[PDB]
């Protein structure tokens, strides 16, 4: 018997198929997070600015209180 190269089929590798698929973000869903992060962003930032006003008047008060300076 003579032995040569043998053939293999099984699944035939599956040639030409789109492996690319959309993931995580769809379109409308990411905009709700996007503007949602903005709405949370400005609201939390301005609370510290109002807290800065408590310091702002009190810091400049030191110059008014000190006249022997």
């Amino acid at each position: 018997x003579x032995x040569x190269x043998x053939x293999x089929x099984x699944x035939x590798x599956x040639x030409x198929x789109x492996x690319x698929x959309x993931x995580x973000x769809x379109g409308y869903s990411m905009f709700a997070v996007g503007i949602g992060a903005l709405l949370f962003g400005y609201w939390s930032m301005m609370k510290w600015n109002r807290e800065r006003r408590r310091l702002q008047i009190e810091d400049f008060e030191a110059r008014i209180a000190l006249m022997p300076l």
Partner: protein, 52 residues
């Protein structure tokens, strides 16, 4: 020009260290009557020689 006397005003003047004054803002509330009258004198008459 007529300058002030060599003896100067207020014997043993000013505190020894700074920031100490800035730490206490209670100096605005207590003892304000001598402070404000000096302030009223200085804006009306700009000369330091008059309101010393």
């Amino acid at each position: 020009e007529l300058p002030s006397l060599e003896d100067l005003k207020v014997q043993e003047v000013k505190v020894s260290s700074s920031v100490l004054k800035a730490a206490a803002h209670h100096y605005g509330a207590q003892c304000d009557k001598p402070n404000k009258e000096f302030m009223l004198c200085r804006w009306e008459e700009k000369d330091p020689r008059r309101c010393l």
